[PDB]
Design a protein around this ligand. Structure first.
Ligand SMILES: CSCC[C@H](NC(C)=O)C(=O)O
Ligand SMILES: CCCCCCCC(=O)O
Ligand SMILES: CCCCCCCC(=O)O
Length: 571
């Protein structure tokens, strides 16, 4: 339309409009209190309704980023609270928007959300239901400034249905807590997953994201032709490009169009989409992003015919390189659902390098004749890591598997901060519980693509305050080689041991009131400092103090002397 705020308001509806606007303000301004954002969203909602009445009204023709950007600069003393971020309000679009994306804090030093009692939450949900949900959208968006905004509406919908169903049940806690705990675990999984898509677009460009899109969509939709996948790749790229840039209104509007196009052409795409297109609009897009791999068509020809033994290999490649390379990736991904997306990108990167080198000779066919043999070592490298690590996880258990990976990556890069090393290594142990139970046919695609997400978490957490050059090297190298780069790292011998500090290993009775999951994080934190202090400590010596630690906390917390057991054991 002529008025862009009117086009999104009419397409998204008023309810989703207010929600996405609140997510936009909370991701950009994360430290601003909840009451300040409510005023801004309502003033945008009031202004949006005036443009729906007449698209030729005042200020209705300006861009969505100028509107949202000007409103962000109206909150007084933004420089006082956010420091030097207000220097970017003195800029013009799209420069002002680019810096507002630069100041997004992945770790925004916010206090952990203390969860009130179930009856208190059910009371607040009954008092002001509209305010209760807005607090959920607000608190989540601050701590996850790259959250998939259309998905966050779905989490908010299930967060509402949880309180609607459980607050009427006799045992409210037995109903609500399993749903709230599952929503939190699934929520952080969606955030870290979406952060990889944004980091791929911002750091490596659209070209690196389209290659990822061609691979995963071909694995998931093997029956669709290349022109149909290229249509879905181009549209899906536009959706995530807008969401990562802050275009949350255009993003959710374009995802609804993509989910509508996919569901209207299921026969040309996949057979697994039938049961999910019967769901509501917000639930429909969620499942399609997680639907199972469609059965690949039987009797497919070997890829040597089209790409190795052909006369126009260099002719078609020189005419359209990225198109010819895109066809190779689509044809290789649809046939191998047992490969990870990242592995398929390495093979496509390997095949591209060969054509650039071999098509220059006078006899190109004789040069790239054994190009597919070059893929053999690349396929076996992740399989050996997953086979060895799953054997280590199955014989140790998740918590012990985290500690084993914790010491491993702490010795690899001891410069990274302890809180970053703890969270990343804890999520590095969850891949064992996630997909070491899978057979080898589905073990590699899930294990490695999960590692790319968790390693990218270490990438962005270290990007803000770079303390180690080896992490920065493996992060900015080539994205697809992030896991091999990190896995090929060895013990950092140049690292000097950190000086001793007795205040780090002191404790109080507050650890006893903490939850079991929060208590082991307190224990894993001391293990990182222990490995940093003694980088040459053997694996069994680390157990003696950690086994001493586990029994010493259980002994002190169970006894009657509140702070005497902890203080007397401070020697
Ligand atoms: C539970 S999340 C699993 C990862 C997600 N789904 C599948 C089927 O791969 C994805 O496409 O990346
Ligand atoms: C809106 C439907 C998008 C489907 C593509 C999902 C790709 C993925 O992340 O696996
Ligand atoms: C199931 C595979 C688990 C991989 C954990 C990290 C392995 C490494 O890079 O040392």
């Amino acid at each position: 339309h002529k008025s862009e705020v009117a086009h999104r308001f009419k397409d998204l509806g008023e309810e989703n409009f207010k929600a996405l606007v609140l997510i936009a303000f909370a991701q950009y301004l994360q430290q601003c209190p909840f009451e300040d954002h409510v005023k801004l969203v309502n003033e945008v909602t009031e202004f949006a309704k005036t443009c729906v009445a007449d698209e030729s009204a005042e200020n209705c023709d300006k861009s969505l980023h100028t509107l949202f950007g000007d409103k962000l600069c109206t909150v007084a003393t933004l420089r006082e609270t956010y420091g030097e971020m207000a220097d970017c309000c003195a800029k013009q679009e799209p420069e002002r928007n680019e810096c507002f994306l630069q100041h997004k804090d992945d770790n925004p030093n916010l206090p952990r959300l203390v969860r009130p009692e179930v009856d208190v939450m059910c009371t607040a949900f009954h008092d002001n239901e509209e305010t209760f949900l807005k607090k959920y959208l607000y608190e989540i968006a601050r701590r996850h400034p790259y959250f998939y905004a259309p998905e966050l509406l779905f989490f908010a919908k299930r967060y509402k249905a949880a309180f609607t169903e459980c607050c009427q049940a006799a045992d409210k806690a037995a109903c609500l807590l399993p749903k709230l705990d599952e929503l939190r675990d699934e929520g952080k999984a969606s955030s870290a997953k979406q952060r990889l898509k944004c980091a791929s677009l911002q750091k490596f460009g659209e070209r690196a994201f389209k290659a990822w899109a061609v691979a995963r969509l071909s694995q998931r939709f093997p029956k669709a032709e290349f022109a149909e996948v290229s249509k879905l790749v181009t549209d899906l790229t536009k959706v995530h490009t807008e969401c990562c840039h802050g275009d949350l209104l255009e993003c959710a509007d374009d995802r609804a169009d993509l989910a509508k196009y996919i569901c209207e052409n299921q026969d040309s795409i996949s057979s697994k989409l039938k049961e999910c297109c019967e769901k509501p609009l917000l639930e429909k897009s969620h499942c399609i992003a997680e639907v199972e791999n469609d059965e690949m068509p039987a009797d497919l020809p070997s890829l040597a015919a089209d790409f190795v033994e052909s006369k126009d290999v260099c002719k078609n490649y020189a005419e359209a390189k990225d198109v010819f390379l895109g066809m190779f990736l689509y044809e290789y991904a649809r046939r191998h659902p047992d490969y990870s997306v990242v592995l398929l990108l390495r093979l496509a990167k390997t095949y591209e390098t060969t054509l650039e080198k071999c098509c220059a000779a006078a006899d190109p066919h004789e040069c790239y004749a054994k190009v597919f043999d070059e893929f053999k070592p690349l396929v076996e490298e992740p399989q050996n890591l997953i086979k060895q690590n799953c054997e280590l996880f199955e014989q140790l258990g998740e918590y012990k598997f985290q500690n084993a990976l914790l010491v491993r990556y702490t010795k690899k890069v001891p410069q990274v901060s302890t809180p970053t090393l703890v969270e990343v290594s804890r999520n590095l142990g969850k891949v064992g519980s996630k997909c070491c139970k899978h057979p080898e046919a589905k073990r590699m695609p899930c294990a490695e693509d999960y590692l790319s997400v968790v390693l990218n978490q270490l990438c962005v957490l270290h990007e803000k305050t770079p303390v180690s050059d080896r992490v920065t090297k493996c992060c900015t190298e080539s994205l697809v080689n992030r896991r091999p780069c990190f896995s090929a790292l060895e013990v950092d011998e140049t690292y000097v041991p950190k000086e001793f500090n007795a205040e780090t290993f002191t404790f109080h009775a507050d650890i006893c009131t903490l939850s079991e999951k929060e208590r082991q994080i307190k224990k894993q934190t001391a293990l990182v400092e222990l490995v940093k202090h003694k980088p040459k400590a053997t694996k069994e010596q680390l157990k003696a103090v950690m086994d001493d630690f586990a029994a010493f906390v259980e002994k002190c917390c169970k006894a009657d002397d509140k702070e005497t057991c902890f203080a007397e054991e401070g020697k």
